[PDB]
Design a protein around this ligand. Structure first.
Ligand SMILES: Nc1ncnc2c1ncn2[C@H]1C[C@H](O)[C@@H](COP(=O)(O)OP(=O)(O)OP(=O)(O)O)O1
Ligand SMILES: [Mg+2]
Ligand SMILES: [Mg+2]
Lengths: 538, 393
DNA sequence: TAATTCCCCCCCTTCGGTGCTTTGCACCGAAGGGGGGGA
């Protein structure tokens, strides 16, 4: 039936009238199902027949309902959505099974015909009119309007979520020792009661829901483990993901690569060691989503490793608030990191990866800090607290990094774990000039019109070298001059430049960059033994 | 007093809510249930398209929680100084924010004061509330209680027309020239007077000068380090020539070579030291323009800051030394420095400054709420490039 | 063809803003596209 809950008042934007879009020609097999569904809904009173007093119209269509022989009826409300007032969404995330706790009794429930059990605002019903075209040809068409929440409207989900919360609140008030997770119309109920006393509480909840016009059919009422919930399989002592199937083909297109990357990203939440960078690099520069992409050798190796990782049964465990949260981080190379969150050794609560590249130039310390921050934020949403970190970096390295850095940075309570490869800085700049070494006053200028430039130097001993350049900007000749100084010198060298841009790049101690000149300079800096950089105004 | 109306052409706040920890969620739920029970806030639905963030802070030495709302976007869209508070021995700040929770808010305007409380692990969709009374944090809220405010502390004001009181947001700054044991007694009398009817030292503030290095022997590198400082300082102080110190920097020489100073260069150096020991002339406060505050990290728990309205025209320069989280926590020290600078700026001029924080965005948004202990929130932006050699200050 | 809405995540691409002086080069940050998952 229809809930006696109050309706949410809605309105149109000022100056907008309403849609008048005509209906596109529908197929016969869809038309018959639409007619049957509409007849049933009109019998139950969810839609109302409309006449020649309503000038609005909006096309309708239908799709298939998951693993069922039923149909889902939808309306293309794009114009009405354009002219409809703005809402504020109340759903802020998705519950995770790793955030659950161990309960002695569990039940999963689903509400049948969720949207069609919530009334729609009376003054807004005239804008929801639609027409069901005749089979082939016969009558002009039967015109209806909606009395309940339609599927396809921009305001329906928030209204339904608020109404469901309002309905559920009184029951949760009187039973504070029963855990209820609600997502849209899906309900997960957990308790520490005996099974016999758990069934009675479930029946009382079902009666309370029915009193408000919401039905819970026995088809989607789960009573025995394992339980299917939000794409996961829940067992009494462990949880896992529902089976993930990877496409197995010999010719790959851009769309197939996109879907495979998405599936691997989804699977990387419980399977440890998933890497997608080599597969993801193939998406750069391609345009059409049907173009055959020849797989490289660095991507085939990644695919072969990920395929072997997913051949083993992997499960998680539930949260225990009486213990500690431990997150351990490992480095995989090429700016990729993995992490595991657990409470007891060799029993993971969850796993994850981090491979974002932020900035033109960076080192290993900054990426580790970014990964720590991301893990901290994720652990606050799921568990509400920050874990203890196990980082592969020496305490002396972090101490000497954060004290000399010009920004402010911090890492929460952590301890060092000796698992190679470790995080370290590859070179350091002298704080004082080196006595008994060449000075290498360098310079470089360019012309902005011809886009031509030069970069040279001179030393105290008397050596000079000038190298003309081409197709370079003004702030590239300075880097070229610094590279020239680093090349034609010994192991210990002073350098005096005229540019703050190059000095600011170099002083951050990068080890990777998107520029080949900076990458050359990084290797030349690692090669040397003692380097000092000084700036002088022009 | 019927606040009415936003700024012409503006719409309203539409800011999302950041996640919180379990203790903060529990405290917020406990506070909001009691607040709703007394008619201060009311539950709303999704048809209200406005939102502002909220969180909670534990005040020092109180062992209780306070709820804070980020009413920063509402303030800029809303339509419609004692120059003796800086010269005062002891100044105290008192919380008078609890007074606003008796004056109701206009029916037309309360839709803009909407906020959402999240849940741990997203077990339930968020719960929304809107204010029925004047909220704590909005700029137009004290400007309504002000007419009623001009009459509460009058039986304490005309008695002793020496104490200077000034109100910003929810805070009352009260200052006198009494002893630390008698100023406290007068503040206690004011507390009693407030109860029945329903420690800063500004004189210890000084600027931070620019000091030129003093040495007996000067190398080529040392001279190069000095000319680079004088060239930058010539922007703030017009009249510095620095044309003889660069004459002995001609030619290619080893950085560790000792250059004897010419007497002409010595005279120039002494005169430029003399023109650096005086305050800058030609800088005034424009009440219409905004204030900008820059912070630089110096290491070993030392920070420097500059407050100015126009580039190279500094209104104040200062240095902050650490006291909590000693060389262990950096976000804590930066947060404390920001709070201190904001407090100093409210006592003078009157407008809170806009901060150029020397931090990354994500770490700040992650960790700044764990140490904040004020009731106002200044607007800020983050810098990314290295500022300079940073030895100017 | 084939058609809808809301939420979370990842990865790639464009354009606007800033600001250093270089007046347009270099760097960064949002919004949009594709894909995964949920109802
Ligand atoms: N593809 C979709 N488009 C629009 N709304 C959708 C879609 N899928 C789900 N919803 C919304 C509307 C549904 O009423 C609500 C709950 O989904 P679901 O339980 O699968 O369907 P239902 O409750 O209408 O039918 P059933 O009787 O099979 O449970 O979520
Ligand atoms: Mg379902
Ligand atoms: Mg359902």
């Amino acid at each position: 039936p229809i809930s006696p809950i109050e309706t949410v008042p809605v309105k149109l934007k000022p100056g907008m009238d309403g849609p008048k879009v005509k209906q596109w020609p529908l197929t016969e097999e869809k038309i018959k199902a639409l007619v049957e569904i509409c007849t049933e809904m009109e019998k139950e009173g969810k839609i109302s027949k409309i006449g020649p007093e309503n000038p609005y119209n909006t096309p309708v269509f239908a799709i298939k309902k998951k693993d069922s022989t039923k149909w889902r009826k939808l309306v293309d409300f794009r114009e009405l959505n354009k002219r409809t007032q703005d809402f504020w969404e109340v759903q802020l995330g998705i519950p995770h099974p790793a955030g659950l706790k161990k309960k002695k009794s569990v039940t999963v429930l689903d509400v049948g015909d969720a949207y069609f059990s919530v009334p729609l605002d009376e003054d807004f019903r005239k804008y929801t009119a639609f027409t069901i075209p005749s089979i082939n040809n016969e009558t002009p068409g039967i015109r209806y309007q909606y009395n309940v929440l339609p599927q396809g409207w921009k305001g329906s989900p928030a209204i339904f979520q608020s109404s469901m919360t309002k309905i559920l609140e009184p029951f949760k008030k009187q039973n504070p020792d029963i855990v209820i997770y609600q997502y849209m119309d899906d309900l997960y109920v957990g308790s520490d009661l005996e099974i016999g006393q758990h069934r009675t509480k479930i029946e009382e909840l079902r009666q309370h829901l029915l009193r408000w016009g919401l039905t819970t059919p026995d088809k989607k009422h789960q009573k025995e483990p394992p339980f299917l919930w939000m794409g996961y399989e829940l067992h009494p002592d462990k949880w896992t993901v529902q089976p993930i199937v990877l496409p197995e083909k010999d010719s790959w297109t851009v769309n197939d690569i996109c879907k495979l990357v998405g599936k691997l990203n989804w699977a990387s939440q419980i399977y440890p060691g998933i890497k997608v960078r080599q597969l993801s690099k193939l998406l750069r520069g391609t345009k059409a989503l049907t173009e055959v992409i020849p797989l490289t050798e660095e991507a085939e190796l990644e695919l072969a490793e990920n395929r072997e990782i997913l051949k083993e049964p992997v499960h998680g465990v539930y949260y225990d608030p009486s213990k500690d949260l431990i997150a351990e981080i490992q480095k995989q190379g090429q700016g990729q990191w993995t992490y595991q969150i657990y409470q007891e050794p060799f029993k993971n609560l969850k796993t994850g990866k981090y491979a974002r590249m932020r900035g033109a130039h960076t080192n290993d310390v900054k990426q580790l800090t970014e990964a720590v921050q991301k893990i901290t934020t994720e652990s606050i949403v799921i568990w509400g607290k920050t874990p203890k970190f196990k980082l592969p970096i020496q305490k002396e390295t972090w101490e000497t990094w954060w004290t000399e850095y010009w920004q402010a940075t911090w890492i929460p309570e952590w301890e060092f774990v000796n698992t190679p490869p470790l995080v370290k800085l590859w070179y350091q700049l002298e704080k004082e000039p080196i006595v008994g070494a060449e000075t290498f006053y360098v310079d470089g200028a360019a012309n902005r019109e011809t886009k031509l430039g030069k970069a040279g130097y001179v030393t105290n001993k008397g050596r000079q070298k000038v190298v003309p350049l081409t197709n370079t900007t003004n702030q590239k000749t300075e880097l070229q001059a610094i590279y020239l100084a680093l090349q034609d010198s010994g192991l210990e060298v002073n350098i005096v430049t005229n540019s703050q841009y190059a000095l600011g790049i170099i002083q951050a101690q990068p080890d990777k960059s998107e520029s080949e000149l900076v990458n050359q300079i990084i290797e030349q800096l690692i090669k040397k033994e003692k380097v000092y950089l000084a700036w002088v105004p022009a | 007093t019927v606040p009415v109306k936003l700024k012409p052409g503006m719409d309203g706040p539409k800011v999302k809510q950041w996640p919180l920890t379990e203790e903060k969620i529990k405290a917020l739920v406990e506070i909001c249930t009691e607040m709703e029970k007394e008619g201060k806030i009311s539950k709303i639905g999704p048809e209200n398209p406005y939102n502002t963030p909220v969180f909670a802070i534990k005040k020092k030495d109180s062992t209780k929680w306070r709820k804070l709302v980020d009413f920063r976007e509402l303030n800029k869209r809303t339509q419609d100084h004692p120059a003796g508070l800086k010269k005062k021995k002891s100044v105290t700040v008192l919380d008078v924010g609890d007074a606003y929770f008796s004056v109701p808010l206009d029916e037309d305007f309360r839709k803009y004061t909407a906020f959402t409380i999240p849940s741990i692990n997203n077990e339930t969709p968020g719960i929304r509330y809107q204010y029925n009374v004047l909220p704590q944090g909005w700029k137009g809220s004290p400007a309504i209680f002000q007419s009623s405010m001009t009459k509460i502390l009058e039986p304490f004001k005309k008695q002793n027309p020496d104490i200077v009181i000034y109100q910003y947001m929810d805070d009352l700054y009260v200052g006198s020239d009494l002893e630390i044991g008698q100023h406290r007694t007068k503040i206690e009398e004011l507390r009693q007077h407030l109860l029945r009817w329903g420690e800063l030292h500004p004189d210890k503030w000084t600027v931070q000068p620019i000091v030129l290095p003093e040495k007996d022997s000067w190398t080529v590198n040392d001279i190069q380090k000095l000319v680079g400082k004088l060239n930058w300082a010539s922007q703030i102080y017009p009249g510095i020539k620095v044309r003889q110190l660069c004459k002995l920097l001609r030619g290619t020489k080893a950085l560790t070579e000792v250059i004897p100073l010419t007497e002409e260069a010595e005279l120039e150096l002494a005169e430029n030291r003399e023109i650096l020991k005086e305050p800058v002339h030609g800088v005034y406060y424009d009440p219409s323009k905004d204030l900008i505050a820059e912070i630089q990290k110096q290491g070993q728990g030392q920070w420097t800051y500059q407050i100015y309205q126009e580039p190279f025209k500094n209104l104040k320069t200062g240095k902050y030394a650490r006291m909590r989280g000693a060389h262990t926590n950096d976000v804590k020290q930066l947060t404390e420095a920001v709070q201190k600078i904001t407090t100093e700026s409210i006592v003078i001029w009157g407008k809170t400054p806009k901060f150029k924080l020397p931090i990354q965005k994500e770490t700040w948004e992650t960790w700044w709420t764990e140490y904040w202990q004020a009731t106002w929130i200044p607007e800020w932006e983050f810098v990314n490039t290295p500022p300079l050699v940073k030895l100017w200050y």
